[PDB]
């Protein structure tokens, strides 16, 4: 499969999440995603084909994971935006007030701004600390997806937010949305990963 930020993948033929970013670990291919999407050694499938397994994750506390892929997978420096793509250029962290977009299989590509950093989400499983909050909307299924500036600087992976009964927070005004993402830089250093760029 071609590995692109924002596309769907299933975990153990049950849950769905979105790919965050193509990364390498030496000769090994992978993509980073959210920790709550799978446990270590769970099977990832894209289009009904096995592409790799969860290699490591931390959830709750943090919310991060990387999936190691078989070598038949094609890593690409891109994030889906409808039929078009945003090139991943690096991972400079943007400040509060910066505009940012995110990509996932449920709501597609949505943009907004970063409103706060170092937010704690108190999920049923336990707290996840150190999350950045943006007000781009998102929905169930978007977890693990890319947050990136249009200049191609990769920001993080979707963790969670304030869902309404329709399964997303797109029908409530931006001022009222809390869409939380896990910062990419600590995931890269923690697992020794390098971002694929173009």
């Amino acid at each position: 499969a071609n590995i692109v930020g924002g596309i769907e993948y299933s975990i153990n033929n049950a849950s769905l999440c979105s790919v965050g970013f193509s990364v390498t670990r030496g000769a090994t291919k992978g993509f980073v995603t959210a920790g709550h999407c799978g446990t270590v050694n769970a099977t990832a499938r894209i289009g009904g084909a096995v592409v790799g397994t969860f290699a490591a994750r931390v959830f709750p506390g943090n919310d991060r994971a990387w999936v190691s892929l078989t070598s038949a997978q094609t890593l690409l420096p891109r994030v889906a935006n409808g039929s078009s793509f945003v090139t991943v250029r690096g991972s400079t962290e943007a400040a509060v007030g910066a505009a940012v977009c995110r990509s996932g299989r449920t709501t597609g590509y949505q943009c907004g701004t970063i409103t706060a950093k170092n937010v704690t989400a108190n999920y049923a499983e336990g707290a996840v600390r150190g999350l950045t909050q943006g007000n781009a909307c998102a929905g169930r299924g978007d977890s693990g997806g890319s947050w990136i500036t249009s200049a191609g600087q990769a920001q993080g992976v979707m963790s969670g937010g304030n869902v309404q009964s329709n399964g997303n927070n797109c029908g409530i005004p931006a001022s009222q949305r809390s869409s939380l993402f896990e910062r990419l830089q600590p995931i890269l250093s923690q697992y020794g990963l390098s971002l694929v760029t173009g």
Binding site: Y123, A124, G160
Partner: peptide, 4 residues
């Protein structure tokens, strides 16, 4: 908030 909930995960996603």
């Amino acid at each position: 908030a909930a995960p996603f």
